[model samples]
Target: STRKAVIGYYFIPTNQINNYTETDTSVVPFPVSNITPAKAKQLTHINFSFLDINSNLECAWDPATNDAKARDVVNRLTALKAHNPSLRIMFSIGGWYYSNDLGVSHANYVNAVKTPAARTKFAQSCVRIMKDYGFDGVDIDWEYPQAAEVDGFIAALQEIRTLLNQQTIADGRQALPYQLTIAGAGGAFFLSRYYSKLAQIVAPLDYINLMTYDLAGPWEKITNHQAALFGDAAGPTFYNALREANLGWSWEELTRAFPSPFSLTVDAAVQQHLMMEGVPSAKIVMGVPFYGRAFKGVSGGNGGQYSSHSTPGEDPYPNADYWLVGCDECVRDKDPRIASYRQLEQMLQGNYGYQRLWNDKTKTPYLYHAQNGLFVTYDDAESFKYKAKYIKQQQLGGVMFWHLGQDNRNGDLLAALDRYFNAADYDDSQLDMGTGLRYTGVGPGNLPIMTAPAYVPGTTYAQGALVSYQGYVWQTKWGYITSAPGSDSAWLKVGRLA
Candidate 1:
């Protein structure tokens, strides 16, 4: 049904924060304070972009790492619960940068998950960070785990989940479980490689946030829909175009390289996770990107969709390090190859010298500049409507966008998702589990009722006291507390009204 959880990833290092492009004065700052009560109420969960395993192989807030502004930004984020008491704020560990094996600063996910000792230490550090930062849970966004890393990945989850359980009892004075989720890759090649281990991968986790975006981008040879809802039928044309893009490859070679029924589309990726890889539908929160991928100097029909595109001397990937600070790259906003919805929304106002086009096959939209052969693929409120419907149709877990910072000031993209997914009331019984071979989990609607005593004024509740108040379950974090559950930061929400 459409009534499902809506999770959003909140990135710290973007122009979306209180920063703006020096070149583009029209761009406005979306500071953390703007996520007011009206906005925070729309989301079920908000995942803080990242925390890292430091050089010590422990979860630590190193200013030298990806998020130098973590302390201030995270403080603002934790205060969002005052806006919406039910909103769950979590910190994700190991994004694309910190998780890589570059041997750089805090790029230690591989080493952290390699052995039991390291995993245990990493898990402890995770718990420490959660309590210290007032986070409700932790998300392991390892970017990806290879064949050799699969076993260690599973063990890491098990260790973390075990620690979280023990900590739950210690913190809540009862079993009020903390969340444990993993961000998994959406590509079929990756899913296929981990097919046999899918069940174990999710065994100790609450749900899997399938990073379903980035299916196509500048890294690829052709200009294709980056986050299409369905597979395009222009297979032959795309195959021919791909071969043309790489003149060294023949038609047969291209066909052999990519077999029939490509799984690049979001639908294929979800099905692979469900039917093929054997992940439960209720445990898969599909990801959508709040940004768009751009292709310049494109030459093809259909506004360069599935067409060959030119990549000059170097690939146009933006430097992630520069974005964290107000550097020249971030200040100039020079990268035309990628842009957030906030940037794209402004560009679309004056038409940005491009014509917006819709592809019925993919159920998404794009923009093409005929003069310059520029193609842009991105999602909007319209595209999100279709995705919300798809989630209901498939009985899948709700949506999780790449970031909150990229959305427009009005939060149009997020509002659209809430309007379709959680705002409307639907039959919870319709969320039946899939018939995958490894399926044995219930839908989100079937959560157990972990009731607690109702909050009573004039009573001094000690720390770790769980109470039912204002249609939510709150656990006290401070002793000698007589304050109302939602009125103080000393209490944390743990459950929804049963």
Candidate 2:
């Protein structure tokens, strides 16, 4: 089934509220207002988690404690929900900085609910907080559920789900059913440790948002900024490979190597695992990065050097601090590194056999340069187009970006995404109707080339006298074939001829 692409943004907690105004400032700007509702409707979910309300005793919830930030986010999100009823906004808890130890403690507290009384209190507190805020559901973003620790975490999640179900029945209020989600490492770490447990726990979950980005980082000998899915030696090549390998390397290793600081791919192996696990394609949301990593003093060398070991003169782009957000004014300001990268892109395209390599295993692309010491793999607009195409071909639910503020506002990456999801060019009129006579033009080879399938043909179609066909309906310009007297399938001939 063809599904509309789901476009979403991660709203950072710090950005949402003003420290001085005691109010939320991020949503008021509506950073994405330029995106129209017609286009916005294509976005099915908005994840609004960024609040650091873990076990910080100082940050206890107080009604009077100026929740302007939360209020602002809620107002904007509520308005957005009104505009697009299908949109779901989930509140995520616990980010990387949040202690995994603290999360384990919290989970233990919830898990210790052996008595019905204790369970009621735990469930009530969750419901109260969620209801006070206008969140559709909660996304648990525990950084890692370690191998030894996962059992406790899974039990906690199951308990939470049970409590949520009971609370929903008792209060008569539409309780936001707890969404059991864990943001795990991408590559080997994920595959080795989490896959089996995740599959078991996922039965109750609506979806799993894979942190697909972040493959290799400065710490590695060679740097792949945006690691391709298939290239990962670790993790599942596709979702199916993960299940087959059953090795911890599959999911954990791939996700670990995202856009540096880690280098890995969420490639085909991971995707296949999700599908095979009985999780709905729509339920799985693939994550894209809103930021890019930087390396200091990267000379005309092979890969990225660690920031700690760099010699003073050896650094090419030595100013690590200067690598600001892509959309920031500082990034726009004259930066030699950015220019050098652009130049390198062109150079690689011409030499070094830098053709896009699709990892049939992971079903993603990576650029490789064997000569002149250039091996950096990151996803740009062009690569994203391929990923988006894969998403469409597989009929997955949609794509999710890590953060939107990292890319240049006018950059082609998001625009390419917009084109992939919302573009009206591909519609239903492209299929060829019966009657081989529908061919309107003859090739230079004197063979009849049917006009592109504009719509699925119905019986009693008219032969062309320059009839307009819907060019938007075709899936792709693969090629055309002819069929027998009564059959609907055509004997396809690939590619367009001159």
Candidate 3:
């Protein structure tokens, strides 16, 4: 059966209070105030950020200790369950660590995972807090694990995965939970370094969220698409960064490395390198940034597209201090203000004459307000259409964004996601999930499933009945099909598209 096309959202933990604060509500904020529907229906999973471990490495919700703020955010999201029955909520632990907050970081990227005592405590903490917050699982966002230590990271994650399952069996929560998803860095610098070990790391993960955004940041002087699929003619080629640097040869030799990052159209596009790496495409969730990077002193009309920036200006969010072993040079020192998704939407209609720019190669868009010497590269509703299509085209696991609550009041981004990933789209074209993996939709269809006639004469399966057979899970949509799901034409295979 076809696997689910998961739509994951990372709900910012403290956003409810901050964004709706006293001063600036003028940008036409995204909220229940806009769309008749909240983001609940459009999501399969909601990951709450900022789940951290304290002195003994015990994890807890609202690590900041703000009870009022914590209760408010939790109440609002937990209420979303009313609309989405199958919604899975995971507490995302250890996001980007700012320099100012180093004293109070979430998960210890190096120490906690390596030490058995700390690791065990970490796992227990995960289950403990998950139960308390009514969360389904935990997402380990360690920023990254650098160098050959990727193996250690894998060991840590594998142990955690086992521990979580053990706790579930002990507590009677779930026999198997896909709550151990991870947020991974998809940049060439990071990915290429860990290419060979990616499969191993993927083994312990319930889902691998590819951070497709941040391709370019403030330090990148030339105005290029931040997360565009392809390297635009105006932007630097993929080889510009993916070059074989410090590999024995002189810098000049590296200059002649390959042709370009997009040398083979999308067929050889390095961006697609995030896939075909041994991990099942069904478990790889593509990530889209709900914010944008703004550049000042941009020279041209395309809002400085493919131009240089003297400075990214003052940053609202601190620069990312991801501490991985091998990344001696990968850390960013600039504080580039990451404009929220709502702000990005407003940029298009701003009085500064912000204009939308499209990158043909990647099928993504950017914003350029040429008049104010400001250029912003971001993902908006228009870009999501292409991304959703790519998800289906790649038979990917699903789509995920940085954080929720950044879309327009009308649920602009959510609508695009709903429309594109709609189970109806798969009607005529089937996604091949290998042989004997027949699946069905969760909607009104009476799709049939195959069951052994001699074994199931008295059994009657309902429309949405799910069964675990042959080591795979399937839901029934078609009332009945002669062939059991082990073979093709199984009527017992059905599932929810949402």
Tens digits of lDDT, candidate 1, 387-489: 7777887788788888787888888888888877665463334533322121122212222356889999999999889999988777776698999997957
Worst 10 contiguous positions by lDDT, candidate 2: 436-445
Clash totals, every prediction: 0, 68, 24
Worst 10 residues of 3 by lDDT: 435-444
Q: lDDT ranking from best to worst?
A: 1, 3, 2
Where model 1 places Cα greater than 4 Å from the true spot, the runs are 1-3, 14-28, 65-69, 101-107, 173-176, 235-263, 276-278, 312-331, 425-498
Judging by lDDT, tell me the better candidate of 2 and 3: 3
Give the per-residue lDDT of model 2 (tens digit) for 365-439: 344333322233445665566566656654555677665444443434556676666677844234222121111
TM-score of 3: 0.69
| lDDT accuracy of residue 383 in candidate 2 | 56
Candidate order (TM-score): 1, 3, 2
TM-score of 1: 0.73
Q: How much lDDT does each candidate structure score?
A: 0.70, 0.46, 0.58
Q: In terms of lDDT, which candidate is strongest?
A: 1
Better of 2 and 3 by TM-score: 3
Task: State the RMSD for candidate 1.
Answer: 17.9
Which parts of model 3 have CA positions greater than 4 angstroms off? 1-38, 61-63, 67-72, 98-107, 170-178, 238-277, 301-303, 313-336, 423-498
